[PDB]
């Protein structure tokens, strides 16, 4: 039988501050249900160690969505609210099967748009350089679809071992640290000033696959939302 993520101590802090959405944005498990052993092939403990997300289908997801702790409701914060908002993770991105082209593994999202997507991507040109098998950030600086609304950055080539991420938002600015190295330093997010519905996500969100049956798979060794206020 499949082992539940909550059978070990490692992920209990974040499971106390999340709901699981799967296979769409519909609720699959509340925080309480995650803490009490919710399990399936989309969401289980691998190697006794990794919180593993699996999902097939274009635009489908298996993702944790940040919640107020202790059974609270959806959280909502702002890039300019004066608080530092922090998420950390340690992620093993395995080699993906044929048909999977891009998997979003962390997000800053609001009521209506993704401010930040960190995604694995099989192949893409950025700024006239061709890159393969890598980790990318996509930041939105507007709501339109032309290329001027996005800032896209090569963060790192995918490694076989765990890669660590820290995301910080303070005073309308975004910083992304990858394996201890600051790669994105103070990206402007002031377009989003006043939007007070932002929240973190993490897991697997499958983008533009070429087969809807191909299963994306991501393993987390650590994940936390870091409260700079200690309630
Ligand atoms: O690859 C492209 O064709 C363009 O895709 C853009 O990123 C989009 C991404 O592929 C996802 O479709 C999607 O994720 C969010 C949606 O924006 C939407 O509001 C939905 O209701 O919530 C989704 C979520 O994040 O959970 O959104 C991306 C988007 O921002 O439109 C860009 O990478 C673009 O440059 C590219 O040409
Ligand atoms: O485009 C979406 O389907 C969508 C992307 C966001 O990341 C987020 O998952 C959002 O989810 C809402 C949704 O309305 C859902 O059905 C539920 O009632 O609340 C979600 C939420 O904000 O947590 O929709």
Sequence spans of domains, the chain = 5-76+93-163+193-227
Ligand 1 midpoint to CA 49 (Å)? 31
Q: Which of 180, 227, 198, 189 is nearest to 86 (CA)?
A: 227
Q: Whose C-alpha lies nearest to ligand 1, atom 10?
A: 207
Q: Is 74 in the pocket of ligand 2 (CB under 6 A)?
A: yes
- How many angstroms does the Cα of residue 114 sit away from the middle of ligand 1? 7
The 3-state DSSP class for residue 190 equals helix
Closest ligand to C-alpha of residue 148 is: 1
Long-range contacts of 139-143 (CB under 8 A, 24+ apart): 139/115, 139/174, 139/184, 139/187, 139/189, 140/113, 140/114, 140/115, 140/116, 140/191, 141/188, 141/189, 141/191, 142/191, 143/112, 143/113
Opening angle at CA 98, ends 177 and 154, nearest 5: 25
What's the gap between Cα 159 and its chain centre? 17
Contact 176, 155 (CB under 8 A): yes
Exposure string of 37-50, with b = 16+ CB inside 10 Å and e = fewer, is ebbeebbbbbeeeb
Q: Which residues of 106-117 are buried (b: 16+ CB within 10 A; e: fewer)?
A: bbbbbeeeebbb
Resolution attained, angstroms: 2.2
The answer to whether 158 and 179 have CB atoms below 8 angstroms apart is no
**C-alpha count within 13 angstroms, C-beta hemisphere, residue 202:** 27
Distance 25 CA to ligand 2 centre (A): 5
59 lines ligand 2 (CB under 6 A): no
Structure tokens at 35: 């803490």
Atom of ligand 1 nearest to the CA of 61: 26
Ligand 2 in reach of 21 Cβ (< 6 A): yes
- How far is it, in rounded angstroms, from Cα 142 to Cα 126? 19
Cβ 83 vs Cβ 229: under 8 Å: yes
Is the alpha carbon torsion for 174, 179, 180, 181 positive or negative?
negative
| CA pseudo-torsion sign 179, 185, 190, 193 | positive
Task: Quote the ligand 1 centre to 147 CA distance (angstroms).
Answer: 12
* Interatomic CA distance for residues 217 and 99, integer angstroms: 12
Q: What distances in angstroms separate CA 201 from CA 66, 81, 86, 119, 130, one per listed residue?
A: 6, 19, 12, 12, 28
Q: Where would I find the H helices in the chain?
A: 12-15, 31-35
Ligand 1 binding residues, C-beta < 6 A: 107, 109, 112-114, 138, 140, 150, 205, 207-208
Pocket test for ligand 1, best of 23, 63, 108, 114 (most atoms within 8 A of CB): 114
CA distances from 62 to 24, 106, 205 (A): 8, 11, 6
Tell me the CATH number of domain 5-76+93-163+193-227, given options 2.60.120.200, 2.30.29.30, 2.40.50.840, 1.50.10.10.
2.60.120.200
Residue matched to tokens 């919710």:
38
Q: Tell me the CA–centroid distance for residue 110 and ligand 2, in Å.
A: 9
Q: Counting atoms of ligand 1 from 1, which one is nearest the CA of 109?
A: 25
Kindly tell me the sign of the dihedral angle through the C-alpha atoms of 26, 149, 120, 227.
negative
Q: Which two tokens stand for residue 109?
A: 């999202």
Quote the CA–CA distance of 158 and 29 in Å, as a whole number.
Answer: 30
CB distance 25 to ligand 2 below 6 Å: yes
């Amino acid at each position: 039988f499949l082992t539940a993520v909550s059978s070990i101590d490692t992920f209990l802090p974040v499971l106390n501050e999340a709901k699981l959405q799967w296979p769409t944005s519909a609720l699959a498990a509340s925080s309480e249900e995650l803490l009490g052993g919710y399990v399936g092939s989309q969401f289980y403990l691998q190697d006794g160690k990794y919180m593993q997300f699996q999902i097939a289908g274009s635009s489908n997801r298996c993702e944790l969505r940040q919640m107020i702790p202790d059974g609270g409701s959806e959280i909502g914060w702002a890039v300019d609210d004066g608080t530092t908002h922090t998420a950390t993770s340690s992620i093993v991105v395995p080699e993906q099967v044929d048909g999977v082209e891009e998997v979003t593994i962390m997000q800053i999202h609001s009521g209506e748009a993704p401010q930040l997507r960190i995604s694995w991507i099989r192949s893409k040109s950025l700024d006239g350089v061709a890159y393969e098998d890598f980790i990318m950030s996509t930041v939105r600086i507007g709501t339109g679809d032309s290329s001027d609304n996005f800032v896209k950055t090569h963060l790192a080539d995918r490694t076989a071992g765990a890669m660590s991420f820290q995301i910080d938002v303070k005073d309308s600015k975004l910083t992304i640290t990858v394996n201890g190295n600051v790669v994105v330093n103070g990206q402007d997010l002031s377009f989003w000033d006043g939007t007070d519905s932002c929240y973190f996500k993490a897991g697997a969100y499958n983008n533009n696959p070429t087969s809807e049956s191909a299963t994306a798979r991501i393993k987390f060794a650590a994940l936390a939302w870091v409260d700079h206020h200690h309630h």
